[PDB]
Symmetry: D2
Subunit: 384 residues, 4 copies
Amino acid sequence: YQPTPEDRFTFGLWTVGWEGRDPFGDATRRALDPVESVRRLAELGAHGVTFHDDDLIPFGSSDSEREEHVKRFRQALDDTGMKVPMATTNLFTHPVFKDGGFTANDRDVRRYALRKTIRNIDLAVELGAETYVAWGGREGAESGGAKDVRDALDRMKEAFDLLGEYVTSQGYDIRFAIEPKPNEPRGDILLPTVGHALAFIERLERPELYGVNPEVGHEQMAGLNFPHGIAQALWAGKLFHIDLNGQNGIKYDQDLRFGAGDLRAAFWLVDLLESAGYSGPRHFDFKPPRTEDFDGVWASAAGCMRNYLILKERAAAFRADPEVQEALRASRLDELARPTAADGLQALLDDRSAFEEFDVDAAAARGMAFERLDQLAMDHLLGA
Amino acid sequence: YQPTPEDRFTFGLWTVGWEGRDPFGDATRRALDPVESVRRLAELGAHGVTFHDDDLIPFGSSDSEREEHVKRFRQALDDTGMKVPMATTNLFTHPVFKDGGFTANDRDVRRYALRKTIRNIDLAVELGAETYVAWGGREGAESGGAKDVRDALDRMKEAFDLLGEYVTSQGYDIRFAIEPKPNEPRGDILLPTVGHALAFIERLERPELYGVNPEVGHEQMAGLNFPHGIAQALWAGKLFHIDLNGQNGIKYDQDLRFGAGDLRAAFWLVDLLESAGYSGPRHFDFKPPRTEDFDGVWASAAGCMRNYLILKERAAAFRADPEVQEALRASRLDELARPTAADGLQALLDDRSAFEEFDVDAAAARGMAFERLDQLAMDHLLGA
Amino acid sequence: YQPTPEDRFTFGLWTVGWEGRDPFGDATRRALDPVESVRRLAELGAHGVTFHDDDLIPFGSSDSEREEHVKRFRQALDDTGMKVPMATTNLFTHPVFKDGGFTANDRDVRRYALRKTIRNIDLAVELGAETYVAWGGREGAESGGAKDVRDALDRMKEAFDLLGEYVTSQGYDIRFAIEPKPNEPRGDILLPTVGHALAFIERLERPELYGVNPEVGHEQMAGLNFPHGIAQALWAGKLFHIDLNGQNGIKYDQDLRFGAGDLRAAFWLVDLLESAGYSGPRHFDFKPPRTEDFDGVWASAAGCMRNYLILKERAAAFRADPEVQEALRASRLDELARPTAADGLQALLDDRSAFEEFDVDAAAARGMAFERLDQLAMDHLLGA
Amino acid sequence: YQPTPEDRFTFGLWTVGWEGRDPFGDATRRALDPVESVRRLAELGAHGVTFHDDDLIPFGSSDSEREEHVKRFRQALDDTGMKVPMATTNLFTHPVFKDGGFTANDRDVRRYALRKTIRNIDLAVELGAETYVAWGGREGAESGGAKDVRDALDRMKEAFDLLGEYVTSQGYDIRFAIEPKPNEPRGDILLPTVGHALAFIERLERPELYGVNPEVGHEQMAGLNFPHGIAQALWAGKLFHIDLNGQNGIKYDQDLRFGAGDLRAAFWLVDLLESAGYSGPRHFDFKPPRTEDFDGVWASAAGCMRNYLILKERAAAFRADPEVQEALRASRLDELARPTAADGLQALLDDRSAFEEFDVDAAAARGMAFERLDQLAMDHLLGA
Ligand SMILES: OC[C@@H](O)[C@H](O)[C@@H](O)CO
Ligand SMILES: OC[C@@H](O)[C@H](O)[C@@H](O)CO
Ligand SMILES: OC[C@@H](O)[C@H](O)[C@@H](O)CO
Ligand SMILES: OC[C@@H](O)[C@H](O)[C@@H](O)CO
Ligand SMILES: [Mg+2]
Ligand SMILES: [Mg+2]
Ligand SMILES: [Mg+2]
Ligand SMILES: [Mg+2]
């Protein structure tokens, strides 16, 4: 289960670079130079890294300091063969964003958030990124009078439409991936789930330019089924990026390494990504726990990839097993994939087997055999 | 706070008619004749009632028994002046539906669910309903191999498309309202939130025919903000029906009377429905607790309406208060409603006040005054 | 991973006998004769069965029908070699219990609940049970005025004290195991967690007679860590029974088979039970999903035991692995087991290494190596 | 609803002094001098303030800086008439505590945490505090191998026993109040609920010296009923302190002002504290949202007290209302307060009205009238 860059594993600079500050805690690790992180991730078999503007260039930097920081980063990329597939903007840390970026009640702040985004789109493109994530972590509220949501959604649409006009004006090849989260750091965050973000995108001026960036722990921290939401994103053709991590339950977002958390959901996730032939990088958005020193940071990163690769093997073995394939037919997964009424409405209406002569008791008595199926799944996950 | 039928309060027959069976409990009340429920609801000042097929006509009824049951119901409607604005199908109680109706793995079941729905659409239309709710309570899974979600969403789209073809073929004026729920009675339910259901509708053949039917406790049992999700539904033009009740938290769906549960969310809900001029009936989908006898059933129904009307008064007083209006300006709710960049992209790009000369520290230092605002809201809710 | 009766796996009659009624659903299976269940469980390698009064004898039975039902059950026990280690009372299904058994507001109901319990204690003893579970599923409330909790706890203490006086008066060898649950079927249930139930027992007249009966999904449906709560029960010497099942999250209690649900917690549970040498039976309190027919019921039962045995092997391999033992020392698990100050208070006060000369920065810089440890755990669970 | 110091409202220095750092955010307010906070809280009608060691004296301070900081603080107390009823230790912020204070795996850290605590107990006593809170926010784990909970509970008992020996050795009048929390900042925290903390205290060497310090949002962030847990604490005689705030749901701990959050639970809380004659200060442990400037900080503080006083009036009006008192009798709250069997075991056993001649159907048919009761409660909370 050793990763190679051909597995397309990517990491944010802010993942392994998290210094361990929390609501109740000072930093437990020193800051990492981005160059060190590129080198150490490449040694572990990562394929690339991703960044926020403020991860690569200290906020408030001069043009000369900006150029220097980018030059050193590109040298480390060249040195390692690491790629930069995705970038994003920090619209959450600085206090100016305390009520939002694109949906801040102050109009001046909204306009600033857009200028800051567009500066970093240009930089993303220069570095070869083809995906641009937007996580509106400060869009939302703690109280009901503070944010008129219809107005905030108008603002949010305006901002994304302006970004789409910008990329089109420049001829850039980049696409946007909007990241839902239900809460934290706002009491409630706008576009709280994959569904709300899919729904919002089809109201944009140029929907083809936008998809979702679901994160495992985000859907889980609302108690939702992450493989289900990924399936709906896939069904819609809108899975433009994914953030992989672990979460134990409905609570604060833990950002555990991938595989930790809800292991059975991680299994079903990998089975789905691999069966659908998802083509995007396997991006980890996780935090090594603040208990760890730097050796533990790199071990937690390595574990992300290891767990992905173990689950990929077990899911493939599950699908290839002739006993599983029989069990899937026993449970009528084949029938689920057949159209209900390719014969058409009128044919259905006139079909006595669908109503007047349907034996409901005989159909109700047929068991679904889902427990045999799932125990096969469990035995394959465990290697039993 | 006495309701009149002019307030457009409606109730499902299955609300006040719930006999009190639960996962661990036998019935605590006898079954109600629909005629009695129409009479008692009309006496309390309700405007109308809604039904599942199986609430009005016992499952398996002959044509003669069906006609009789409908005749007696219509006599009670005529007697009271009650309306029937909405109907729905029971695709969840009978064991035939144990893996779904429209997304059951068995194709024969899928076809049956459609025939059963279409029979009741015809009846809804005969009774004057203009809205048809669909709650796929059995669409989903307890285990990951049992349901391939992409295939189930194809099936689900097929079913809704066939229903749209049917209503169009008949020239009926009725619209569909799809009801999300995150879980219960399946481990995870397909279309678990308002967002997922909005997203799904824009993939249907005739989207204009479908909207959502959000229920207070449904969004709450995923920890989501119900007024926020209603605002997104309103923003999209898709709020076709609403189900009102109370819920205390992320747990099993309690179906408490409206006002019980999260009272501050109930306030913000009513403020939003009334400020947006929502035109649909105020429908209660609730269960009087099984502790209650029939006097308590009617008191719980009455309390639904009373609480709505108290919250309507307090929200109106909040919005009309000149101190509140000042506080809203102090918190820049007016600025939230202004376009970010009506001057256009290029104008924003060339505006030095949005970047090169934006004083981020001065903007960050400006407090939002949300606590003063919310304490005004609290004082108005409490009548203080 | 084939169970034998020497593994001490037990099942409630109401587990495999669940007919599949839910909040929204009629039964999907016919009722099982207890005799059939004993025979089928014994064939799968179970060691024993448990019962509620009402599972073995239909509520309202004559003395002659009671004797007959018990005779047939004992013949099946004799036929198979199955044991009956535990019994309990149904104080939740009949509508008389709608506000409680031992804490019902009606005094007459309280007294009835006690008489019903004591009748079944006598029967439990006759069948050889040494443990008597009490699950006050109806003790609690949906609204705040309905139940004065201090008064209800007085009632609850009175009832348990009377039961202790009864068992002592008769010379019986039986002990009580109080089962917490946070909610469902009441809005909130009294003694909602292992901690609340441990706390309550030390106020009883004869605490030695009572312990807890924690259930996996019960603690999980409050988002709590089930292995942690079992550890506190063990620490206190109060783990008198355990109920094993699976749960996916904070939601309605799903009663999935053991291993399903939170698989990593199931691992850590088995590691703890086995490392502590827990001596009680491994009792499954689960429901085969209503999707299943009878073949699926027995497969779900078998899967309970299989998963226990797989996790037992993997946890034992984890603890025996010399690399794990090194990792545990690296993470100072050995130091956690050493007394903080066996030198005593004054010695600590006078120890400059504990304050005036403690290098806090050097201690803070030492990483905990928990990620290496946990990835070893993950590799052992997966057999990697 | 204007507070006076006679209402015994208290605030932590770290409440109004929170600078607004969060998992994703830099500070939005400058640090407050403790002297300013005492002055501003006294102007709002607070009675006193509470502190962590590190709130009053910067970590690492010389003896001379420690004396200065305490002198200025005492001058502000003298200037205002504010009291210091409670103190606590910071065993969570510094990185040395990243795996715990009293249950850190490193023994040296455990010993340090005890020395740091005892230094601040001496200071608390000097300032007149009679209560000492302990919140083991770092006691717990993110992964299952990292913390053997039985060993950690032994350590935790040792630490509390040593603190009890210390206070007894010095002749101090101070009592300890242990603060449960379920999670955040550890994945799971030891003593996660009021129940677990009550249970733990009765294993200490000198239980009379320890009680609980429940916090509203802590119990709520596990989905538990805070008034219920306070009632059990009261029933046990162990409510030594309370932390008042608001929380919207099972999610990260929001620390909203008191009244915000679950308003109906806040009502029932105040009704219980006032009906039981709780004698301790009404302490607010809350964070003014980081959206706010300093004017908003003081308004959020004021709102804590205002909401308490409004709820106190409404709860008193509820209990005094003759219609409510009738409704309570209708719902048999009077019968709940009567002993079940003061006639004794044998008398119950021989009472045919409790079994052989108990009419279960007639008792089951009696409704509980809880909905009428609760709607009275709702009308009183709303002033309707
Ligand atoms: O919850 C934090 C979010 O996961 C971010 O890390 C975004 O992915 C990128 O800003
Ligand atoms: O959770 C149950 C749902 O609320 C139903 O009552 C639908 O609204 C109608 O079938
Ligand atoms: O939640 C249901 C409880 O688990 C019961 O099955 C008790 O264990 C026994 O009555
Ligand atoms: O969750 C944070 C806790 O509420 C603390 O503020 C303690 O009360 C005191 O350290
Ligand atoms: Mg992310
Ligand atoms: Mg509904
Ligand atoms: Mg149980
Ligand atoms: Mg606190």
